[PDB]
Ligand binder design. Structure first.
Ligand SMILES: Cc1cc2nc3c(=O)[nH]c(=O)nc-3n(C[C@H](O)[C@H](O)[C@H](O)COP(=O)(O)OP(=O)(O)OC[C@H]3O[C@@H](n4cnc5c(N)ncnc54)[C@H](O)[C@@H]3O)c2cc1C
Ligand code: SF4
Ligand code: SF4
Ligand code: SF4
Ligand code: SF4
Ligand code: SF4
Ligand code: SF4
Ligand code: SF4
Ligand code: SF4
Ligand code: SF4
Ligand code: SF4
Ligand code: SF4
Ligand code: FES
Ligand SMILES: [Fe+3]
Lengths: 137, 291, 652, 183, 94, 92
């Protein structure tokens, strides 16, 4: 079994960070699959909850550093949204840890590589999220 | 503060006065030192780590397990033991492959390290948790003499895991010795090694003595009345090494050597007899006359 | 109409193919609904690749194209033009990143990389099905450029643009233009006088009919997009009448506050009321309120009564089409490398401090002297790579100019004092450009400058004399050296300028691992940024010398003149819009937009929200926050993203 | 004259595996980042009074000179960590030296004095064990005659002996359990 | 190409493509400037459009001809390490 | 441990004056052009059976190590001129 992780990365600093890891040949686990959005501000609870419904073992979200959003304050909204979402997931029996959000600049390929490494290990240790199997009954 | 007091080898079995000095000094500062029953050699990190890294970590974890079972953190007055147990604790928390290997070995003796032990050095514990102000408040006999402060290597390094500040220009010990009324004299290559570490004292004695001699010469040129350390290994090298330097180089200095706990003990009005300066290879009497 | 998708899997030579089983991804792609064509090719962006896509769009009547290749940040526009040339709307094209995001990061896990590429193709195909044709927004380009930073790079950009006939605005933070080049004494490899060749350009820019120079000013806000930027410039108050200012300098004598002169790198001492350097353009004085005590002693001496503390900064609103960022760099602070003793030992200095010491118009009157006793050093040691090629200080890059300026200044010291012994402690001598290796050969053969291959371990000061000892291994002899010197010079690297953080936030540009500004592509676009209409020039983009900076200044002027010359650019219609039939005017969206695009209005007798299309930059925050679902961002609609999420696990 | 036949291409790889998992693959693989700058040698206190040059140990390791495991020079490092603290390439020098010494020990290049130190920890649980003089001193100072250490705890001594046998450290040093001495 | 390790084609081919179909650029391949007279702003230039012996407007660039040609010439593009035919295309992405 | 006190700074200049006017100022001043590449040592037939390293002689000359004048190593060169023929810096 290999974890299924979905990612959401903004097109500016974060996408650049993930790209820089590739330019630098910074190897990381192949569990994640990144979805591109223009800003992390585009990310809302329904996209994360939809991912778990589909069978995600882990969900990752990456945006610009607070204050460095290409669109000035998009990430500040996402930050308020993700904090409530962490608690909502615990209320739904989904380990808080299955959700991971980080701030990554285009200059942080090493940080992205390590964030991917750390997140993969976290989800692998938790094992598969049994929501889809529970719903398919 | 409650801490499992790791003793090591040299302090409890040779320079026992450092143990006595520590127990009262720490009691005066409000630290409850509990016995870490059955604790062994840390083991010596430079010596054992050079023979087999796996043996060094497994035996260190075995000691870490004693304090973990006691539900308390560790305190030590030796840089050697501090470095060995601190680096062991960090490696077991940061590396799961290493932890897995060690716990597979510890399972054979019915043990399992869970990463809850924190290792502390008494000098940084005094500096960060107690406060230097408390040292001066307990000074009964101000020691107005010049001190050649020897930090040692395993006290602040490796900085990437120790996080005790600068290893190039530290103030920590200087501020602790100065609180007793003493003066930390600046000397050449202050942060240099005494020469005993990494098994050098045992395998390459004359080479170790050459470095110790350079340090003593520099301290004497700076106007020091003695040398203060935070390491029984450094202590032995500076103290016993002088007899060896006299027998191998023909150089005599009769330079008093003290461990910080012994210096803090004198400062707190302890009986020099209880600090066991009589076992010291180099007489501390010249320094005792100066105070 | 039903989707008919064409999936193209690129091998990119072996960059993808070597890790991802591209033919296998291609076979998998064909098993997905609507994928009527699927091909794998060595180089999709190449002419045969583009012709393949184009021919297929016409022959197989495709209405969706999926390119499984590199990053959209590199070729998304390339392929959009390729499909648009075949008649396919460019927004019916979808990129799947399997190189930077897969093959390059999963090199030792080929089977899993191949599985991941399949899912990414499926995720792309899933979004592709629901993509819609959008009309690129044709916008006009204001015939005006803005250059931020008045150094050799920025000056070059404004001169070229002004010479082309384009109205250009040049904003300079400090009271004078010239940058770090104005602080240098001479310039390698020609040993030309730095200011003596820079001043004519500073003069040209100051009196250029097409360039408006705003010295002692800062850009405080930038709004808009390519061709339509609205910029706010704060013309800082000097507290001295600009027009009545003669620039004689008689009010400074009275000032009782001494401030360290920034221009002289903290060696010299200036007054609250001062002038940056003698050849300064514009030639005018300034009062630094950060250190001024408002005693008014300077005003009593000042004849014209130019001094006015009631002076207020002026906010200038200007409209520009393009922006060139040329804010330069700052010298690394070597205090962190504690073993070299900078900030502890008096006779340890940085090379930039040495430049000011050598410069005739400097604080020491062009005399290289020890800061401890004022004596001229008979023995000097240069330590290379200080703050560069060093992981302990976080700078794992080469600062490019240090090998050369160290050899240069060693030649200048020898010309002024031949008896001076100079030793350079290095790892690699990087004399890589025209006349550089020759300059290096010359330093040793002609000037007798010595080189020691070995990065020093530490510097130790003799407290009795102030002399320094350099501990280092002569790696070419396998022996440890402990040579004494009268002065130690640290060849400090380059780091981004302090204001870089503010300028980044205002322009919306990114930074590379070295912390300098990020270019669109290192080779495809060295002076463009991923942000349209925003370009870079000089050291703010990365460590480099004067000609490289002058070349970039010229390059940026060319790139920045393209939209200006066209007078029209195409911008992305990935904007938000409100479905009036669903919006009940709850007002949640209004305050979420930092550009105030969504606004409440009356329609058909009741209240609804309406996005002002031109003010929307396309972030997708307001639609994400809309509780009714009335707001949607074209190209990133919730349904499109929903299908993309399903695509990772199944075909939809 | 060093010919390809006198070199071992795998030395760096062999040093890296001996260092796995302790002190770690990433730790020891750092030797590959070395660019021979000399900062380590210049910072070496031992190097200032001997022929020992820290940079050459790493060079020999990368070039493939197996003699580095037979050298007395690798044993002159005190583990002062100065090189470790100053390396601009993040080479974990001190750890690489210790790892090279592990391979040296396995090849039979271990000093008798070191084997004796290791024998004391195995025999008494301590490198510097308590003596008759220790007991008398501790008594006169007011401390417990025998410290609460493994030396006087059979449970703990036996625990150590089990781990030592499991780690093969006894065979490494060449210790005979029935004779109670090194072979 | 260093330091990104991108394919040379990654950056160069799109640029070759664009330049060949640019409305303001007249590309004269297999040609050489044989004379330049005049001064700044008023240069008179002579370009020799060398004979390819193939009609470019009619040519498809399929290369059925390359398979049939019987004479082998060392490929200059491959630095003499490759063998081309008398009728040829320097490289596949030409 | 080589200290400034163990070095003779003028050794290079001293070698050049000894070579002026024979074999010539330009000839012997060529030692200052040396960039320690090693081509001379690699080409040395004597260096293949001894501790003699041609490049180190020139290094010692530039660093100021007087012991080079007392060395038996400088006397192991046969004057084969191979190094002279291959030096990329025109060192004679
Ligand atoms: C010690 C040393 C010696 C050197 N010697 C040489 C040499 O001999 N030859 C050589 O070719 N190169 C040399 N260089 C490199 C050279 O200094 C650079 O190439 C040059 O300064 C780059 O010019 P620039 O315009 O890109 O940046 P800069 O010269 O630094 O100019 C940037 C300008 O923009 C201004 N600015 C900064 N922030 C803002 C803001 N937020 N808003 C508005 N304006 C702003 C600054 O005040 C400055 O005037 C040397 C560098 C150093 C450190
Ligand atoms: S403020 Fe007045 S005195 Fe001072 S430089 Fe200007 S004109 Fe001269
Ligand atoms: S008012 Fe300010 S600028 Fe003028 S003399 Fe006083 S401190 Fe100096
Ligand atoms: S240009 Fe030279 S001194 Fe500067 S970082 Fe590079 S190698 Fe070091
Ligand atoms: S958030 Fe949605 S429902 Fe509320 S006013 Fe805005 S568009 Fe209408
Ligand atoms: S999507 Fe909304 S919040 Fe974002 S720029 Fe547009 S109108 Fe503003
Ligand atoms: S200091 Fe580091 S990079 Fe330099 S020679 Fe030593 S190990 Fe190598
Ligand atoms: S750790 Fe060892 S090699 Fe490194 S400086 Fe210290 S004694 Fe020298
Ligand atoms: S640049 Fe992109 S499309 Fe072109 S060959 Fe490389 S991966 Fe393929
Ligand atoms: S490639 Fe050869 S056969 Fe094909 S159209 Fe051109 S000349 Fe004719
Ligand atoms: S070949 Fe020439 S440049 Fe190279 S080390 Fe010898 S003398 Fe110097
Ligand atoms: S001339 Fe002398 S030093 Fe040069 S290669 Fe011949 S023997 Fe060697
Ligand atoms: S653009 Fe990166 S978070 Fe808004
Ligand atoms: Fe001039």
């Amino acid at each position: 079994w290999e974890p299924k992780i979905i990612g959401f990365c903004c097109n500016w600093c974060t996408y650049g960070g993930a790209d820089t890891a590739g330019v630098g040949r910074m190897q990381y686990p192949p569990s994640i699959r990144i979805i591109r959005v223009m800003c992390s501000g585009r990310i809302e609870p329904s996209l994360i909850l939809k991912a778990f419904k589909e069978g995600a073992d882990g969900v990752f979200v990456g945006g610009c550093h607070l204050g460095d959003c290409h669109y000035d304050s998009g990430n500040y909204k996402w930050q308020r949204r993700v904090m409530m979402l962490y608690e909502l997931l615990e209320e739904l029996g989904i380990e808080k840890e299955r959700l991971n959000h980080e701030w990554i600049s285009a200059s942080e390929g090493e940080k992205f590589q390590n964030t991917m490494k750390d997140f993969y290990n976290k989800i692998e240790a938790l094992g598969p999220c049994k929501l889809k199997e529970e719903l398919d009954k | 503060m409650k801490y499992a007091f790791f003793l090591g080898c040299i302090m409890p079995n040779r320079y026992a006065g450092v143990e006595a000095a520590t127990r009262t000094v720490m009691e005066k500062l409000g630290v409850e030192l509990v016995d870490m029953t059955g604790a062994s050699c840390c083991p010596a990190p430079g010596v054992f780590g050079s023979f087999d890294q796996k043996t060094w970590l497994t035996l260190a974890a075995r000691n870490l397990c004693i304090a973990e079972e006691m539900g308390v953190d560790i305190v030590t007055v030796c840089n050697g033991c501090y470095g060995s147990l601190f680096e062991a604790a960090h490696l077991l928390h940061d590396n799961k492959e290493a932890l897995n290997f060690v716990n597979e070995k510890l399972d054979k003796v019915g043990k399992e390290y869970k990463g809850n032990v924190k290792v502390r050095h008494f000098a940084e514990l005094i500096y960060n948790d107690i406060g230097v102000d408390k040292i001066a408040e307990k000074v009964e006999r101000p020691l107005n003499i010049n001190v050649g402060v020897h930090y040692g290597c395993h006290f602040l390094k490796p900085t990437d895991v120790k996080h005790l500040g600068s290893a190039e220009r530290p103030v920590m010990l200087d501020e602790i010795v100065e609180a007793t009324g003493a003066k930390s004299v600046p000397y050449a290559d202050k942060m240099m090694c005494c020469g005993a570490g990494g098994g050098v004292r045992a395998r390459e004695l004359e080479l170790s003595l050459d470095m110790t001699n350079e340090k003593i010469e520099n301290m004497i040129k700076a106007g020091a009345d003695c040398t203060v350390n935070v390491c029984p290994f450094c202590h032995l090298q500076f103290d016993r090494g002088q007899i060896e330097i006299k027998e191998k180089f023909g150089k005599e200095y009769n330079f008093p050597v003290l461990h910080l706990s012994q210096l803090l003990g004198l400062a707190m009005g302890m009986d020099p007899k209880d600090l066991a300066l009589s076992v010291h290879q180099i007489s501390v009497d010249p320094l005792l006359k100066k105070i | 109409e039903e989707p008919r998708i064409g999936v193209y899997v690129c091998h990119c030579g072996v960059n993808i193919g070597g890790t991802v089983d591209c033919p296998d991804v291609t076979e998998f792609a064909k098993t997905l609904k609507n994928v009527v064509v699927a091909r794998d090719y060595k180089y999709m962006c190449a002419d045969p690749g583009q012709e393949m896509i184009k021919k297929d769009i016409k022959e197989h009547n495709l209405n969706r194209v999926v390119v499984a290749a590199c990053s959209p940040r590199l070729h998304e526009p390339t392929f959009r033009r390729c499909v648009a040339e075949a008649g396919l709307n460019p927004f019916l094209f979808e990129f799947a990143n399997i190189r930077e995001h897969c093959s390059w990061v999963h090199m030792h896990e080929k089977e899993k990389a191949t599985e991941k590429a399949k899912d990414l193709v499926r995720m792309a195909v899933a979004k592709a099905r629901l993509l819609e044709p959008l009309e690129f927004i044709k916008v006009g380009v204001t015939q005006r450029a803005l250059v931020i930073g008045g150094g050799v790079a920025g000056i070059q950009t404004a001169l070229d643009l002004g010479d082309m006939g384009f109205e250009t605005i040049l904003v300079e933070k400090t009271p004078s233009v010239g940058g770090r080049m104005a602080q240098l004494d001479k310039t390698f490899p020609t040993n030309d006088c730095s200011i003596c060749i820079l001043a004519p350009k500073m003069v040209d820019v100051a009196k250029h009919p097409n360039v408006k120079l705003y010295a002692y000013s800062e850009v405080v806000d930038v709004q808009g997009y390519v061709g339509n930027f609205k910029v706010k410039i704060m013309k800082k108050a000097r507290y001295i009448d600009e027009t009545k200012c003669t620039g004689c300098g008689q009010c400074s004598e009275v000032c009782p506050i001494d401030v360290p002169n920034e221009f002289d790198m903290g060696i010299g001492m200036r007054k609250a009321i001062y002038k940056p350097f003698p050849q300064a353009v514009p030639a005018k004085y300034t009062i630094d309120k950060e250190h001024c005590i408002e005693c008014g002693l300077c005003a009593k001496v000042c004849g014209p009564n130019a001094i006015d503390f009631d002076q207020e900064p002026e906010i200038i609103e200007a409209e520009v089409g393009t922006i060139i960022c040329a804010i330069g760099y700052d010298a690394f602070d070597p205090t962190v490398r504690e073993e070299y003793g900078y900030g502890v030992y008096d006779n340890v200095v940085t090379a930039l401090e040495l430049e000011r010491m050598i410069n005739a118009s400097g604080p020491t009157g062009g005399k290289v002297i020890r800061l401890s006793d004022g004596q001229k050093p008979k023995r000097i040691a240069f330590i290379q790579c200080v703050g560069s090629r060093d992981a302990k200080v976080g700078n794992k890059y080469c600062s490019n100019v240090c090998c050369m300026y160290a050899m240069k200044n060693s030649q200048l010291i020898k010309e002024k004092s031949p008896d001076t012994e100079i030793d350079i402690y290095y790892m690699d001598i990087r004399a890589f450009s025209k006349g550089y290796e020759e300059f290096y050969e010359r330093s040793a053969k002609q000037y007798g400058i010595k080189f020691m291959r070995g990065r020093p371990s530490q510097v130790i000061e003799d407290p009795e004399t102030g002399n320094l000892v350099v501990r280092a291994e002569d790696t070419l002899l396998g022996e440890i050296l402990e040579k004494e010197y009268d002065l130690v010079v640290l060849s400090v690297g380059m780091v981004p300028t302090k204001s870089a953080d503010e300028v980044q936030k205002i322009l919306g540009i990114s930074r590379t691992p070295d912390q300098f500004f990020m270019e669109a592509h290192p080779k495809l676009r060295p002076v463009d940024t991923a942000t349209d209409g925003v370009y870079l020039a000089g050291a703010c983009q990365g460590p480099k010398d004067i000609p490289a900076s002058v070349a970039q200044g010229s390059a940026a002027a060319s790139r920045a003149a393209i939209p200006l010359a066209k007078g029209e650019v195409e911008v992305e219609p990935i904007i938000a819009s409100v479905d009036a039939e669903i919006c009940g005017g709850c007002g949640v969206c209004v305050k979420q937009c930092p550009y105030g695009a969504p606004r409440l209005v009356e329609k058909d007798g009741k209240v609804v929200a309406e996005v002002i299309s031109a003010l929307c930059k396309g972030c997708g925050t307001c639609p994400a926050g809309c509780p009714s679902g009335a707001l949607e961002q074209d190209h990133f609609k919730t349904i499109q993203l929903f299908k993309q999420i399903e695509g990772m696990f199944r075909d939809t | 004259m060093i010919y390809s036949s006198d070199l071992n291409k795998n030395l760096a790889s062999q040093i890296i595996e001996a260092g796995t998992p302790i002190p770690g693959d990433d730790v020891v693989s750092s030797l590959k980042a070395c660019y021979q700058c000399g900062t380590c040698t210049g910072s070496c206190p031992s190097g200032r009074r001997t022929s020992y040059r820290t940079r050459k140990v790493i060079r020999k390791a990368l070039l493939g000179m197996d003699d580095v495991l037979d050298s007395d020079d690798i044993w002159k490092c005190t583990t002062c960590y100065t090189c470790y603290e100053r390396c601009p390439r993040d080479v974990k020098v001190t750890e690489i030296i210790k790892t090279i010494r592990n391979l040296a020990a396995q090849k039979g290049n271990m000093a008798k004095a070191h084997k004796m130190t290791a024998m004391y920890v195995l025999k008494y649980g301590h490198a510097v064990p308590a003596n008759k003089n220790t007991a008398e001193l501790r008594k006169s100072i007011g401390l417990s005659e025998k410290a609460p250490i493994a030396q006087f705890s059979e449970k703990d001594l036996n625990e150590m002996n089990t781990l030592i046998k499991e780690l093969g450290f006894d065979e490494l040093i060449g210790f005979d359990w029935e004779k109670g001495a090194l072979k």
